[PDB]
Design a binder for these strands. Structure first.
Lengths: 95, 83, 97, 109, 97, 83, 95, 109, 95, 83
DNA sequence: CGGGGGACAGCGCGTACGTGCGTTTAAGCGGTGCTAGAGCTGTCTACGACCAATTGAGCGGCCTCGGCACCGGGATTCTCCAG
DNA sequence: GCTCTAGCACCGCTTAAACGCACGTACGCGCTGTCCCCCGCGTTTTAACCGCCAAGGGGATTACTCCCTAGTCTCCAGGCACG
């Protein structure tokens, strides 16, 4: 065997099985999705680091990413993202 | 307290002087409206970002430091105000 | 007849004088009040130091003037000396907004 | 007598890992300390974006009567959407091509 | 008389075909020869993964189609349809290099 | 061993196919050499960066991972080979 | 009782007197220099961090920031900076 | 000696009560057995309905610049949507009045 | 002494604050939402009972309401509801 | 295999007999296409309900039982086939 | 090779800001009082980070079949032509 | 929680900015001619693609062992506050 090259494989297939049970996935489209998740995670993490340095904060919690989503993602997607992220953090607090 | 329509406070000859610094010889009368519109668009973006910075910091007064942070984010980095 | 120049000569003097000029091109008080107008458009009771108003000022002439070099490069591309709005939004589209 | 290993993503009710996202935040070197809301929130926004774009991808594939998603469908799906386009203006999709965006005067009369 | 399509009709058919198409528009081996040549200009005896050649291919053609989209906007700006070197120079100067 | 002229290996009809993908109907005859030049200049812009990562890695073989990194440094991030 | 603000004040003033002993300096130009030093320092730091990320290096080395100088700093100033940095580390390790 | 109490709504991540709807389906006397996914499914459906209509009602209240929702806002919210119109064609709204609906011939000129 | 009358009070208040934190409530609107949720609940419940009679199943599962919501609820509203319930029941079975 | 037009199999003279049952004495040409349209709409609703029953029945052949069930749900209860 | 489409300049034609100059007014310039909150200081507690263990989902590899790649024939459409 | 300081609020002169009208000149552009230049298609060549086979450079991995680097205690000295 070889070393594991970590990816977002099973996650993209299960979210597709949630949203469209019948359609299939190509390897090229899956690579596109991997690079998309890499890009968006990199953008949000970098801007979270920027707000950490900017407010002289060593701490990055959901509030700074809510700040960053309000920064980067425009408008409709921003408030949508804040909505399901708030639901997610509330179910996290309720475990 | 509340204002409605101060966007013409950036006057037309101010826009003419801006375009003279921008080296525009002839400025049509149609031009001033979309210059005010794009200036509204750009400031709406910048002040949205800056308000988000200040509301993150739990303050009620916008600093110029947060302004130059917003100019770092949007890609118009400005020098000379403590950035 | 009184003294009067041909069209463009005073415009060239204006261009030369304000490329040489370093002082501010726009008025202070309506700019600050417009910043306040956008501020209470988003969150009420928002305050600004004069330095922050200067910073948004500097950003405004930087952004607008840069759009004007892009715009008159578009205008000289179109073989014209008079600029039209389509130059501005086409320039904004090429910039990648 | 340890408790059963139950997943933080299901604690979020989500599928993108709290574990992997928290690990790449810690080892991506972005801050000294990272709050617990950070990876769940960011996994949530990635799952929202992923669900939205695969919704548009599935509709694009069924519009082309095809079953399996292709980067042509992905690229089509991205530039039908204005806020996705504003999000991904400077990003190029592999093998996606260009959506048909034909300017009017060069079309014949 | 053999049938002959009008000038531009086959051009529009090529446009529709290639917008519908997703495949590569460059012969891959002369592209690989060129990228090995220009790599040798900076560092001698470099080796290329075939996937790396494909990645340089797709990034290059994406850059080219972005520039050509910009120059189409420049050409319809100039009341014309034949794209010119001045359009390409304009697009590059607007994009900031 | 050494190669001198492969910029002409990117053929004129291949550039025509690219411009049809760019939606160009009519292409001037002077365009093609300029496209060769600007693609050429873009290849120095990309490949000096890519070679710079490669020589940082103490390696000799160009990889697509460094191609992705070079393209995202210039803000032309390429999906489809990262990860 | 006010707080100390960290700046590049006498350092830029010293190198100014080294390159031009007879000239003066304004505070607005000093803000320009301070933001310039901060911005270029941040650009080099960001590209060095990304380079360390790409090649799985958990430390920042002079070799990879030299790489970053080839990346960000263009052309002839790049090789001047290479000469300056190699000379500087030469007289540093000899010190 | 006992597990700590967790509501089924928190298990499903809903804030409509799963247990209340389960009770009211038991004592609504619709079947002698009810599958466990049925009441949480129904509560999620009503959650989507109420969330949709409270988006609409809050947006309408902002459009008439009033802070509190009123049945007039609700009646504008239902009647300005097509599928809610089919869902509630035969429904009377107290103090909601009627949607602003003027026919084209009733206008002058 | 008073007998408590059950309603849908806190649930509609919480879901409104989750969708609009800055929008208030009037009590007559609150009665309208009470009557709405009661009406749609009894519609779905009666249709489910009729399906259980109709396929001679003695039970109402998630699949019966899945059938019933393409019966009564239209289209995109129904498919969004099916998706919401599907993710809800997967979270329920995971908990 | 697939069929693309059997809506017209409910023919123009057939629609004429159907309206002859309703007492309609003169029928312009514009009515017939909208009658097949609303025929498609109603039967589309009924068969949506019916296939939803049928898929819930875990079978592959439609019976008249779920047909009269769907006519009951839509509100046009049919006598003759119940039970 | 052939050809039609494109580009563009001269002439003209209507046009629209540029600019000179008087007016207004309100920005610009100098002056005063107060407090919002910006910012600094003390408490502490929420909070997050790290480590042994342990497990359980996630990934490397393989195989299958069927959606899709490859193949073939008439229609419809686009276009062009000729009526 | 405190405090203190510059922004907020309010006040009073001063013509510069603005603005608006009017004369004037240049500005864009359409028609149309005119010239020209590249696309469509046919034909010919030729290496691209395929596909098939040998060989070895180095990418990547594992291990080893040592170079190095943050941290901390402490000390002192040059940059910042202040004038």
């Amino acid at each position: 065997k070889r070393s594991r090259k970590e990816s977002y494989s099973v996650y993209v297939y299960k979210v597709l099985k949630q949203v469209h049970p019948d359609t299939g996935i190509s390897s090229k489209a899956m690579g596109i999705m991997n690079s998309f998740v890499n890009d968006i995670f990199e953008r949000i993490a970098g801007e979270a680091s920027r707000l950490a340095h900017y407010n002289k904060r060593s701490t990055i919690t959901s509030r700074e990413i809510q700040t960053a989503v309000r920064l980067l993602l425009p408008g409709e997607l921003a408030k949508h993202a804040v909505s399901e992220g708030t639901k997610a953090v509330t179910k996290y607090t309720s475990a | 307290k509340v204002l409605r329509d101060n966007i013409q406070g950036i006057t037309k000859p101010a826009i003419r002087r801006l375009a003279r610094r921008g080296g525009v010889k002839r400025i049509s009368g149609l031009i001033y409206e979309e210059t005010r519109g794009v200036l509204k668009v750009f400031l709406e973006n910048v002040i949205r970002d800056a308000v988000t910075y200040t509301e993150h910091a739990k303050r009620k007064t916008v600093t110029a430091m947060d302004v130059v942070y917003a100019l770092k984010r949007q890609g118009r980095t400005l020098y000379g105000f403590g950035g | 007849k009184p003294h009067r120049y041909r069209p463009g000569t005073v415009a060239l003097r204006e261009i030369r004088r304000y490329q040489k000029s370093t002082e501010l091109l726009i008025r202070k008080l309506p700019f600050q009040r417009l910043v306040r107008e956008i501020a209470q458009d988003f969150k009420t009771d928002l305050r600004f130091q004069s330095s922050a108003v200067m910073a948004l000022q500097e950003a405004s002439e930087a952004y607008l003037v840069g759009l004007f070099e892009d715009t008159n490069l578009a205008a000289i591309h179109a073989k014209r000396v008079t600029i039209m709005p389509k130059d501005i939004q086409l320039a904004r589209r090429i910039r990648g907004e | 007598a340890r408790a059963k290993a139950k997943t933080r993503s299901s604690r979020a009710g989500l599928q993108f890992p709290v574990g992997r996202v928290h690990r790449l935040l810690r080892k991506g070197n972005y801050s000294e300390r990272v709050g617990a809301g950070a990876p769940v929130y960011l996994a949530a926004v990635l799952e929202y974006l992923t669900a939205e774009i695969l919704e548009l991808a599935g509709n694009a594939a069924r519009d082309n009567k095809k079953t399996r998603i292709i980067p042509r469908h992905l690229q089509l799906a991205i530039r039908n959407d204005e806020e996705l386009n504003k999000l991904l203006g400077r990003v190029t999709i592999a093998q996606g091509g260009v959506l048909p965006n034909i300017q009017a005067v060069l079309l014949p009369k």
